Design a protein around this ligand. Structure first.
Ligand SMILES: [Cl-]
Ligand SMILES: [Cl-]
Lengths: 336, 336
């Protein structure tokens, strides 16, 4: 149940079960280091999980493999399956050993494109560059887990479907985990781990800007994996004591109501998360991964700025959400 | 120089020169209705324009042809080339007649995919659904122009390259137009025509909203081709006299400085253009087609709301910017 054990089992060559957010796909995947995969591992997967056995790859390894996305644009789920994979010690490629062998060719250290062919019976998945920092899928989660084991960022994953024929949910996954001696994890638990044990954000440049509220200092930040720009509007020296803080994600209702505006003034640090696009005003008007993503970026920004005790302009968070950072940074959470 | 003649020459089967915005591509294309294209028309193109001869198609026509975009994602210029086109009365397909013959097969009324093959030597281009309403390219312009002549929304277009070997600009295109007896046109001038002689925008539903400025009526609008859902916040009954108006496109001056809010308050109609995405605050921080797009959508909204005389909260517009909507609507542009 603990991220550090999950990494240790993956290094050890064992499997691990990984759950995503219950308001995402809400599924459990067996997860093993693709480098340590063995025939009997594929056989366990197709037998007691009976989902699609898939092979999570990095974008680098896909380029090294000359292996693109099989579909690019779809319509008006989100999942990057690839052209199917086969090796060339293969007859049909659907046997457990041969499938294992197909994985071996793909994730070999110095693999070439001619070590592999398409189509096949192994189904590679291309993680996004920054991994579970941005997309909280099993694809990114299998890779980033294997990376933490010091292995090739490659994992083999298979959905766990109940004997009933429906998708095993947390209840059924916990039983299955203990029935077979496997530990379990939340990729959201992996987000917060990565945010706690890694320098994920780097500062870019400082500026001074003149606003109707006053003068602010702009710290422009960038996070590994993604070209987005996170901001911090600072007044004063947040190392000067308690700092009045808002971590801030856009929500197209400023144009009508007023929260960010009513937040610019009680600055008399404001964080801002970059996203590749900001929703337009019209459309329609948990996500624990998106929460730990947000406040993890917001937390590394405030730590880099020297924040040590905060006056939050947010409604209360998840309870221990801010654990892993400077101290218990919150003494007073705001009203309206 | 005048849109209605440009439509009339296309109906007659002659060519017309179309320029895009001086800051987009800044090129002139010969443009002829693909349905009226003849061997000697292709030959004039490859001789005295010497760009790529291309065949603008609608998405309907492309689907009927089973004919996709040849690249889907590349790198995030913007141009929708297709898999190359060839017919089957062709030997090589590069002759003036054979290219002309290839076009005919594509734009024949009830053409099939088996009327046509790939690759070839004609280069079809897929316009976006709403045409020149959204993308102000020669591709959309060739189709919409041919449509206005009541013909198949299909045109053949070719870049006009100087004898010098560089791209003919307005000066050189104007000379070329008169040397060969052709009329010349601006895609922006076609934008404004469509906005003046077509009902392009339709409302969806009315609502009431409660805001910190007060209560508004929400009019949701959609425009042909739908990259958008447009809004109009109304206070009062604009049909009872003068209306204080702002047409509003998003920009950095909402979160940091204060214009939109300082527009919410003087509403004691605010229009809002739908955008496929709203730029984030970090990134980096004429387009005359995009202007006539803006105020044409904003103008059909304000007429639909019954606006006839305005007090604009904008800085002054282009001269004759409005020109077609609900007589001379502006007496008072309001200050900073
Ligand atoms: Cl195979
Ligand atoms: Cl050809």
């Amino acid at each position: 149940s603990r991220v550090e054990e999950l990494v240790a089992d993956i290094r050890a060559g064992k499997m691990v079960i990984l759950m995503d957010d219950e308001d995402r796909e809400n599924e459990g995947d067996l997860v093993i280091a693709a480098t340590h995969v063995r025939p009997e591992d594929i056989n366990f997967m197709i037998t007691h999980a009976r989902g699609l056995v898939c092979l999570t790859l990095s974008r680098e390894r896909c380029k090294q493999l000359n292996l693109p996305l099989m579909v690019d644009q779809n319509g008006a789920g989100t999942n990057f399956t690839l052209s199917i994979e086969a090796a060339e010690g293969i007859t049909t490629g659907i046997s457990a050993a041969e499938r294992a062998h197909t994985i071996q060719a793909a994730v070999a250290a110095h693999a070439k494109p001619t070590d592999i062919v398409q189509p096949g019976h192994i189904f590679p998945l291309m993680a996004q560059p920054g991994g579970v920092l941005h997309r909280a899928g099993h694809t990114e989660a299998g890779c980033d887990l294997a990376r933490l084991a010091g292995l090739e960022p490659a994992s083999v994953i298979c959905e766990i479907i109940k004997e009933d024929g429906t998708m095993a949910r947390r209840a059924d996954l916990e039983i299955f985990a203990e029935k077979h001696g496997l530990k379990i994890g939340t990729i959201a638990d992996l987000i917060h781990y990565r945010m706690t044990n890694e320098q994920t954000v780097e500062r870019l440049d400082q500026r001074t800007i003149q606003t109707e509220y006053g003068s602010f200092e702009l710290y422009r930040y960038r996070e590994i994996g993604n070209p987005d720009i996170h901001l911090a509007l600072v007044k004063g020296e947040p190392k000067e004591g308690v700092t009045t803080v808002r971590v801030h994600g856009f929500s197209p209702v400023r144009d009508l109501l007023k929260l960010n505006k009513a937040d610019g003034e009680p600055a008399w640090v404001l964080v801002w998360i970059g996203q590749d696009h900001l929703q337009d005003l019209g459309p329609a008007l948990a996500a624990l991964s998106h929460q730990y993503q947000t406040i993890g970026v917001g937390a590394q920004i405030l730590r880099d700025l020297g924040v040590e005790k905060m006056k939050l302009l947010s409604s209360p968070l998840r309870f221990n959400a801010l654990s892993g950072f400077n101290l218990e940074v919150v003494e007073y959470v705001t009203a309206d």
